[PDB]
Design an enzyme around this catalytic site. Structure first.
Site, PDB file in Angstrom:
ATOM      1  N   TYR A 138      30.660 -14.558 -15.092  1.00 29.69           N
ATOM      2  CA  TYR A 138      30.954 -13.243 -15.840  1.00 29.69           C
ATOM      3  C   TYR A 138      32.232 -13.597 -16.812  1.00 29.69           C
ATOM      4  O   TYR A 138      33.205 -13.919 -16.677  1.00 29.69           O
ATOM      5  CB  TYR A 138      31.127 -12.350 -14.934  1.00 29.69           C
TER       6      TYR A 138
ATOM      7  N   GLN B 238       0.912  -1.249   0.055  1.00 29.54           N
ATOM      8  CA  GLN B 238      -0.129   0.075   0.037  1.00 29.54           C
ATOM      9  C   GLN B 238       0.856   1.144   0.089  1.00 29.54           C
ATOM     10  O   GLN B 238       0.243   2.588  -0.310  1.00 29.54           O
ATOM     11  CB  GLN B 238      -0.922  -0.103   1.299  1.00 29.54           C
TER      12      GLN B 238
ATOM     13  N   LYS C  85      -6.221  -5.319  -0.073  1.00 31.16           N
ATOM     14  CA  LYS C  85      -6.707  -4.754  -1.226  1.00 31.16           C
ATOM     15  C   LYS C  85      -7.827  -3.919  -1.193  1.00 31.16           C
ATOM     16  O   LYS C  85      -7.892  -2.694  -1.680  1.00 31.16           O
ATOM     17  CB  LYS C  85      -6.625  -5.987  -2.180  1.00 31.16           C
ATOM     18  N   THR C  86      -8.910  -4.555  -0.943  1.00 31.22           N
ATOM     19  CA  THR C  86     -10.070  -3.967  -0.602  1.00 31.22           C
ATOM     20  C   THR C  86     -10.267  -2.735  -0.091  1.00 31.22           C
ATOM     21  O   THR C  86     -10.656  -1.592  -0.261  1.00 31.22           O
ATOM     22  CB  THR C  86     -11.245  -4.998  -0.337  1.00 31.22           C
TER      23      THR C  86
ATOM     24  N   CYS D 167      21.106   9.870 -40.881  1.00 34.46           N
ATOM     25  CA  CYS D 167      20.032   9.786 -41.996  1.00 34.46           C
ATOM     26  C   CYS D 167      18.795  10.505 -41.716  1.00 34.46           C
ATOM     27  O   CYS D 167      17.994  10.260 -42.583  1.00 34.46           O
ATOM     28  CB  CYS D 167      19.619   8.084 -41.689  1.00 34.46           C
TER      29      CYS D 167
HETATM   30 ZN   LIG Z   1      20.082   7.519 -38.277  1.00 33.57          ZN
END
Ligand SMILES: [Zn+2]
Ligand SMILES: [Cl-]
Ligand SMILES: [Zn+2]
Ligand SMILES: [Zn+2]
EC number: 5.6.2.-
Length: 1040
Positions: free
Chosen positions: A789, A82, A105-106, A576
């Site tokens: 790793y 909560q 919840k309620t 672009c």
């Molecule tokens: Zn680009």
């Protein structure tokens, strides 16, 4: 702090602020020059610079007012769940309540509507049953003030009461309306034109039945129909919808989802309100798995006399279930079946009239999946391993998913306590049991123990104690935890073992929510770096103040179409002109807003220098928003890795951050200066990206001359009933006479485990792959939780890695050849090793069968070499017999050593050990003389360059593969038919210009010394600012 600047980090003006002030939680110097103000909000107000901090000021005020009201009327403080929900209510967000079942919840939604009613806002509450409508109305009117307007609608109302609800509706004279789902289904259009500020639904399944119900709710929160038609067309098209930012929707809250929304219609919430209807796959389980080696009913009878009560038994087929039900009925066991009278028998089991319930193993069986009462179901027994039929053959494989469901009925989060369960398997088949063990290891990371190593008394005591702790009212300990990673693939692996319940779309990123025993855990991925050095300003983006250098950083932008990355604040791609930009400024803003809602935040980037720098950039940015920030380093993406990482939680290691800064500065200054000098000569741009690249190119260019200089003479001799011999020069005699023969015994030790360099060389050579693709495959295997790793410089193996080796050898019945070896005691990380005792053959079986589906055959082979390399290092030394044979060829004495016998096996089981035919002390005839020339100094391969880089102290595990591939991308090198690297004409004259004018700044001796300096900076053994001064004078000499 590392005394840097970030271009969007000020929390009040959104502008540039230094590293130190963000760490202290203060805005920039422009907003508030005072170092130590009494209150940051008041100081900004007085100076008339208060722009954005007002939002956070009102946010904490609104949340505190909300929490204060909750404690006044409910009597208790907000729980962790909560607490997170309240922090989202005051922020106007809509979400799905991800939490275990309970009255919390309620009550929260009831309290939330009352708080909104106190502000004049109107709320609506929806409940699946008219009975819940009445009870919640009773709870409201008891607690609500007389001034509040509460009205309800259900079927059995007074005639006057029904009319007074409707009359209050048409006049808009109401504050809270409490009707059932039937009202929503029958009054779609009446609510379709009214705009409410808060809608709470208790049952999501009542709404999923009709697509119109979903649209009715979206209409209720203030979404135009023009938005619905475009959104529904987009999702039906298969794409994702983008909202109009001027839309001001209401608040929608879902309580609990049984999670069966097959339709696309619930996905409208994801695109229109940025939250997901949860498929609550709960992974919170604590189960002990015990295997009994036979199907003796006497042991089953003895076992049941220990368990006594709360027992489920799963048979493979119905006939076996009937036999067991009859068998335990002749014996004096209170047992019931499920295949005929399922409803009556299960209810008798729930109340306690039945102690044992028998069912059939189905993938979604009612007893297997459709039941949920852990408070009674304590023990689960399998009369045979659940199995499936795979492909069109009669091949029988274990059904691991069915086993996880049935065993999981004994363990879930109950009343805030995660209860303990026991799963017992009666399996005669050893191979089927072994197949299930590895399948369970891959998915659940849960082991199965044998019968002889199980204390039944302690396990049942643990089961009953955990439940008796759950049944009493508990003191809340739930916390909301945020996990931040940089790789989307790492997050996906996290979502597999944490369990994705819901997902929120926060601006540029997606945040997933999961249930754990500690509370709510949130995790998200950054999709790469967040900051990088600016291109312009000062010394190529580095300023100088008070005699010290300050690095200036700006957010990264990645174009989604062409992929170009840049740091300038631009709307479109500079290459672009597309506007489909992955902008990390929005990613940072999303993290700041998330940091408000979470109690605790953990940064979990990669455990190396590059990852640490990313961690500090995020932490310094998030510090002005929350103070609960820490760092964890994960060495494996698994449940075990996450637990170990949290146990070693720490703050940010600034020595690692400073090591990254000096490394990036060196590449920036050396590269830009050399690129500019090369720009004027050879026309192209960005021809140099660092000192290391130039040095390695020097090796390749100069190798051609010394490779040609080293041409000596060889002769291939194939001997009858013997191996081939390479002898120097022109041999004239056709007879080789053995003059001395000695045979000896030795114990050959295995090679150490893989490091990043050793793995790159061996795997590239054996699989005929470039070192860059091998590195990427290593990265994928780590990010998917299969290996440790992959960026490591050490051969160190921990006891856990040795424990993994023993577990596998014990499985294959070859425990005798186990030999634990820690290898090196030095090293930040371990060596590249598997994290689970599964070899590549079992992986391939589960890929061919589809237990996993995102591993290519290149991933399999790379994993196979790693697994064999690691287990060879953990196996006993191989005992061999060899010979030292001295032969006379053309009067030249030559000694040959070769292994002839293997007396005792060992690591040769994993790495083959080649034997050679035995030699005798006689004369041997020559069948053929293959005359050829081979150079004493061989040319370079991609594997050899990496191997040469480490032995010369050049490069790092993070750069090895990158250094090699840059040369190919620049066109300086090519590969011939035999995959040998060879300099191009452009590359030779590029190196020629550098070697004749700038050898001092390029030479290997300079490269190694600088690398050792920076490694000392990483350990904190050399000064960070002083290292930058040395780099400045070196580049300043050639700057003119
Ligand atoms: Zn680009
Ligand atoms: Cl009993
Ligand atoms: Zn500012
Ligand atoms: Zn007995």
């Amino acid at each position: 702090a590392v005394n840097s600047k970030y271009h969007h980090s000020c929390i009040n003006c959104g502008g540039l602020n230094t590293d130190e002030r963000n760490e202290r939680g203060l805005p920039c110097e422009v907003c508030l020059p005072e170092d130590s103000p009494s209150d940051i909000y008041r100081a900004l107000l007085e100076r008339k610079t208060l722009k954005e901090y007002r939002f956070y000021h009102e946010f904490w005020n609104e949340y505190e007012d909300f929490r204060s009201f909750f404690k006044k009327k409910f009597g208790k403080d907000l729980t962790g769940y909560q607490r997170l929900w309240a922090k989202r209510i005051v922020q106007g967000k809509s979400f799905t309540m991800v939490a275990p079942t309970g009255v919390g919840k309620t009550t929260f939604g009831m309290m939330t509507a009352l708080w909104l009613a106190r502000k004049g806002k109107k709320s609506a509450l929806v409940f699946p049953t008219v009975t819940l409508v009445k009870q919640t109305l009773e709870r409201l009117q008891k607690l609500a003030d007389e001034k509040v307007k509460i009205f309800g609608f259900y079927s059995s109302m007074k005639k006057e009461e029904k009319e007074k609800f409707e009359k209050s509706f048409e006049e808009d004279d109401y504050h809270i309306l409490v009707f059932s789902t039937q009202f929503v289904s029958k009054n779609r259009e009446k609510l379709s034109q009214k705009r409410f500020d808060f809608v709470f639904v208790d049952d999501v399944d009542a709404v999923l039945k009709a697509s119109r119900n979903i649209d009715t709710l979206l209409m209720m929160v203030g979404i135009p129909e023009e938005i619905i038609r475009k959104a529904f067309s987009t999702i039906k098209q298969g794409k994702i919808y983008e909202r109009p930012k001027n839309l001001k929707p209401g608040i929608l809250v879902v309580s609990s989802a049984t999670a069966k929304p097959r339709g696309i219609r619930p996905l409208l919430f994801r695109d229109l309100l940025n939250f997901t209807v949860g498929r609550l796959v709960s992974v919170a389980r604590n189960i002990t798995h015990v295997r009994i080696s036979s199907r003796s009913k006497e042991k089953l009878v003895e076992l049941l006399e220990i368990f006594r009560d709360g027992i489920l038994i799963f048979a493979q087929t119905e006939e076996e279930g009937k036999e067991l039900y009859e068998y335990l009925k002749r014996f004096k066991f209170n047992v019931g079946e499920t295949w005929s009278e399922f409803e009556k028998n299960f209810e008798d089991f729930k109340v306690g009239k039945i102690n044992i319930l028998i069912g059939v193993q189905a993938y979604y069986g009612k007893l297997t999946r459709g039941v949920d009462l852990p408070e009674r179901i304590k023990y689960v027994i399998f009369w045979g391993t659940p199995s499936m039929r795979f492909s069109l053959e009669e091949l029988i494989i274990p059904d691991v998913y069915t086993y996880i469901q049935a065993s999981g009925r004994s363990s879930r989060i109950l009343n805030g306590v995660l209860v303990k369960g026991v799963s017992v398997i009666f399996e005669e088949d050893e191979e089927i049991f072994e197949s299930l063990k590895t399948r369970l290891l891959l998915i659940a990371e849960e082991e199965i123990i044998e019968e002889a190593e199980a204390n039944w008394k302690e396990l049942v005591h643990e089961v009953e104690e955990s439940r008796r702790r759950s049944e009493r009212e508990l003191t809340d300990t739930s916390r909301s935890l945020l996990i931040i990673v940089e790789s989307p693939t790492k997050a996906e692996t996290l979502s597999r073992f944490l369990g994705r319940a819901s997902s929120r779309k926060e601006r540029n990123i997606i945040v997933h929510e999961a249930v754990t025993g500690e509370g709510v855990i949130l995790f998200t991925a950054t999709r790469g770096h967040v900051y990088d050095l600016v291109t312009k300003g000062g010394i190529h983006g580095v300023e100088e103040e008070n005699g010290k250098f300050v690095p200036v950083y700006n957010s990264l932008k990645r174009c989604r179409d062409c992929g170009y990355q840049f740091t300038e604040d631009r709307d479109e791609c500079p290459v672009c002109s597309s506007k489909n930009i992955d902008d990390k400024t929005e990613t940072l803003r999303a993290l700041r807003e998330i940091s408000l809602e979470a109690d605790e935040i953990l940064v979990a980037t990669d455990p190396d220098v590059e990852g640490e720098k990313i961690s500090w950039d995020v932490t310094q940015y998030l510090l002005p928003s929350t103070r609960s920030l820490r760092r964890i380093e994960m060495h494996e993406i698994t449940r075990y890795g996450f637990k170990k990482a949290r146990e070693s939680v720490r703050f940010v290691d600034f020595n690692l951050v400073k090591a990254q800064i000096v490394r990036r500065v060196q590449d920036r200054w050396i590269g830009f200066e050399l690129s500019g000098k090369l720009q004027k000569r050879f026309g192209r741009s960005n021809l140099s990206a660092g000192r290391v690249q130039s040095t390695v190119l020097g090796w390749i260019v100069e190798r051609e001359e010394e490779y040609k200089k080293s041409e000596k003479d060889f002769t291939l001799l194939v001997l009858e009933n013997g191996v081939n011999l390479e002898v120097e020069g022109k041999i004239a005699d056709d007879v080789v006479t053995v003059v001395e023969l000695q045979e000896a015994e030795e114990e050959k030790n295995p090679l150490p485990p893989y490091t990043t360099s050793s793995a790159l060389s061996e795997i590239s050579q054996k699989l005929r792959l470039g070192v860059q693709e091998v590195m990427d495959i290593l990265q994928d295997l780590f990010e998917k939780g299969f290996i440790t790793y992959h960026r490591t410089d050490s051969t160190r193996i921990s006891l856990e890695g040795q424990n993994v080796a023993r577990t596998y050898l014990r499985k294959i019945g070859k425990e005798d050849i186990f030999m634990g070896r820690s290898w090196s005691t030095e090293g930040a990380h371990e060596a590249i090793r598997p994290v689970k005792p599964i070899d590549a053959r079992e992986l391939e079986e589960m890929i061919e069968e589809g237990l996993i589906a995102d591993l290519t055959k290149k991933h399999l082979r790379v994993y196979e070499l790693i697994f064999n390399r690691f287990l060879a290092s953990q196996s006993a030394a191989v005992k061999v017999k060899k010979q030292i044979v001295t032969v006379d060829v053309d009067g030249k004495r030559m000694g040959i050593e070769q292994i002839v016998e293997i007396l005792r096996d060992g690591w040769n089981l994993f790495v083959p050990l080649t034997v050679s035919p035995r030699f005798e002390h006689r004369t041997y005839k020559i069948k053929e003389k293959k005359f050829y020339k081979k150079h004493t100094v061989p040319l370079f391969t991609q594997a050899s360059i990496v191997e040469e880089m480490k032995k010369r102290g050049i490069g790092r595990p993070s750069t090895y593969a990158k250094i090699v591939e840059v040369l190919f991308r620049r066109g300086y090198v090519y590969e011939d038919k035999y995959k040998r690297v060879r300099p191009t004409r452009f590359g030779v004259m590029v190196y020629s210009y550098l070697k004749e004018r700038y050898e001092k700044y390029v030479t290997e001796e300079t490269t190694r010394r600088l690398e050792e300096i920076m490694d000392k900076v990483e350990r904190g053994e050399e000064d960070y600012q002083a290292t930058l001064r040395l780099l400045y004078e070196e580049i300043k000499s050639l700057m003119e």
